[PDB]
Homo-oligomer: A and B are copies of this chain.
């Protein structure tokens, strides 16, 4: 099997092209670069510059007003010095965001919207290619709880798989590596595309038709990670979950995402 990380044009997928190739990719690899999805280097650049600015030229006070009382990295700014001197982060979602100023909010709301739109659209194709209809319908499933995290830096990360439906990654030596065909392959930047990692929820909802590839950071740079995560009430078949590898401890025939993962979102699971 070719261990190459494939690339797909979202527009072409929406047009019904490369359906066999896309299915095979999802099943055998669970990752790919996505082009023509409204996300390019330009957009990244705009949000990139304004956030970096804040990181470097932002005061401790301004950063304070955009720092959550709990260091959950869910919203706002996150960090003998601190760990920001190791890496700084900025997170946001559909609501309850913390923006340092006018120009920042405009650029980042726009950026998030594009990321969310692309994520839902590719996730939509993942569902169609596998003939999947989530309990409660597709749109209810995709109107979910995304989380966008941007990190600016000055092994690093253990091998894990994501627990999202899909995860979209943009970046600026190749850091990120993912397991393909039984070996960790390089995942370099593509100014013209976004890197897509399928997560465990894609595996679950499609009844195991989608692989959730393990990945990690090999030993300055920025990364934008967008987790498309299901709602707490996303429901699925327990017996089906058991059929594709989930070691669930759930009584009954049906369960929710909340029943399975608990009361706090968990984005990754080490492997």
* Residue of B with least CB distance to A83: B159
Contact of A242 among B83, B96, B200, B231 (CB under 8 A): B96
Find out whether the CB atom of B71 lies under 8 angstroms from the CB atom of A161. yes
Find out whether the CB atom of A262 lies under 8 angstroms from the CB atom of B249. yes
Q: Which interface residue of A69, A145, A245, A259 has the most chain B CB atoms within 10 A? A: A69
* Residue of B with least CB distance to A161: B71
| Bound complex: CA A70 to CA B259 (Å) | 19
Q: Would you call A80 an interface residue if the criterion is a C-beta within 8 Å of the partner chain's C-beta atoms?
A: yes
- For window 242-271 of A, CB contacts with B under 8 Å fall at 242-251, 255-265, 271
Find out whether the CB atom of A69 lies under 8 angstroms from the CB atom of B262. no
* Residue of B with least CB distance to A77: B182
Query: Taking A70-B200, A210-B69 as contacts, is the C-beta distance between A249 and B271 under 8 angstroms?
Result: no
Residues of chain B contacted by A255 (CB below 8 angstroms): 263
- For window 34-92 of A, CB contacts with B under 8 Å fall at 60-61, 63-64, 68-76, 79-84
Q: Would you call A233 an interface residue if the criterion is a C-beta within 8 Å of the partner chain's C-beta atoms?
A: yes
Q: Would you call A122 an interface residue if the criterion is a C-beta within 8 Å of the partner chain's C-beta atoms?
A: no
Find out whether the CB atom of A80 lies under 8 angstroms from the CB atom of B182. no
Q: Which 10 pairs, one residue from A and one from B, show the smallest C-beta to C-beta distance? A: A68-B245, A260-B263, A71-B271, A74-B247, A232-B251, A233-B251, A69-B203, A232-B249, A70-B245, A249-B265
User: Could you list 11 A-B pairs, sorted by A, with CB under 8 Å?
Assistant: A30-B69, A68-B208, A69-B208, A70-B211, A72-B246, A74-B246, A80-B218, A96-B243, A249-B262, A259-B263, A261-B263
- Inter-chain pairs besides A70-B161, A81-B184, A232-B248, 10 sampled, C-beta below 8 Å: A28-B64, A69-B212, A70-B211, A72-B246, A74-B247, A80-B184, A80-B218, A231-B251, A249-B263, A251-B258
